[PDB]
Amino acid sequence: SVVEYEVVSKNLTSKMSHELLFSVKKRWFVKPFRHDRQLGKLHYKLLPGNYIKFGLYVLKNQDYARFEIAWVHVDKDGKIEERTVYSIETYWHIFIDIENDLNCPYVLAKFIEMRPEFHKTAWVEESNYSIAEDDIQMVESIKRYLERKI
Ligand SMILES: [Cl-]
Ligand SMILES: [Cl-]
Ligand SMILES: [Cl-]
Ligand SMILES: [Hg+2]
Ligand SMILES: [Hg+2]
Ligand code: NI
Ligand code: NI
Ligand code: NI
């Protein structure tokens, strides 16, 4: 009744790759079942259904940050299908600062805040919390905010 799924979570001297899964149904981040700080991975066991993957890819020395949103579809038979629905490039110094914005989409600030510490992975606590926006409004709010910021 669950499917295994892996994403990248690592923060190294020169680069960071920070991915997390978000449950469409629950409207909050999915809790990983295992993290691998050695290989820099997060492992999930997923019920069939729809998920959003947030991805942040940073080259620190180039002051470069790419942010992506992907739709992840998980079927009964174990089949997983992924589609990128949004991608933007900007400076790391800008993207990192979103954290401190007084008004911006909460899910995005939370995502950034949860980035992996150096040589660790990004964890996600137990929760029954859900944001108020559905997946469409949520994504649109993120795009609108980043269009302005960038
Ligand atoms: Cl290193
Ligand atoms: Cl370099
Ligand atoms: Cl799909
Ligand atoms: Hg889907
Ligand atoms: Hg904010
Ligand atoms: Ni650990
Ligand atoms: Ni399907
Ligand atoms: Ni749109």
Tokens of 49: 């259904």
Q: How was this structure determined?
A: X-ray
Of the candidates 142, 27, 149, which has an alpha carbon nearest to the alpha carbon of residue 85?
Answer: 142
> Taking ligand 3, which is a single-atom ion, which protein residues have CB atoms under 5 Å away?
73
- Sequence length of the chain is 150
Distance 30 CA to ligand 6 centre (A): 17
Of the candidates 150, 142, 146, 118, which has an alpha carbon nearest to the alpha carbon of residue 52?
Answer: 142
Residue with tokens 């949103």: 69
Quote the number of domains for the chain: 1
Q: At what angle do helices 135-149 and 106-113 cross, to 10 degrees?
A: 70
Residue with tokens 């992975």: 121
Task: Please tell me the distance from the alpha carbon of residue 108 to that of residue 96, in angstroms, as a whole number.
Answer: 11
Beta strands in the chain (DSSP E): 3-11, 15-23, 28-29, 34-36, 41-46, 49-59, 64-74, 80-91
Range of the domain at 100: 1-150
Distance 81 CA to ligand 7 centre (A): 8
> For residue 110, which ligand has an atom nearest its CA?
5
Kindly list the distances between the CA atom of residue 78 and the CA atoms of 22, 48, 68, 71, 81, in Å, as whole numbers in the listed order. Answer: 18, 8, 24, 16, 10
Residue 79 makes CB contacts below 8 A (sequence gap 6+) with none
* Resolution in units of Å: 2.0
Q: What is the CATH number of the domain that holds 90?
A: 2.60.40.2930
> For residue 147, which ligand has an atom nearest its CA?
8
- Residue ranges in 40-82 assigned as alpha helix (H): none
SS3 helix, strand, coil % of the chain, rounded to 5? 25, 40, 35
Scored b (16 or more CB within 10 A) or e, 29-45 reads bbbbeebeeeebbbebe
Q: Rg of the chain's alpha carbons, rounded to an integer?
A: 15
Task: Please tell me the distance from the alpha carbon of residue 54 to that of residue 17, in angstroms, as a whole number.
Answer: 11
Distance 13 CA to ligand 6 centre (A): 19
> Taking ligand 1, which is a single-atom ion, which protein residues have CB atoms under 5 Å away?
12-13
Task: Please tell me the distance from the alpha carbon of residue 53 to that of residue 67, in angstroms, as a whole number.
Answer: 11
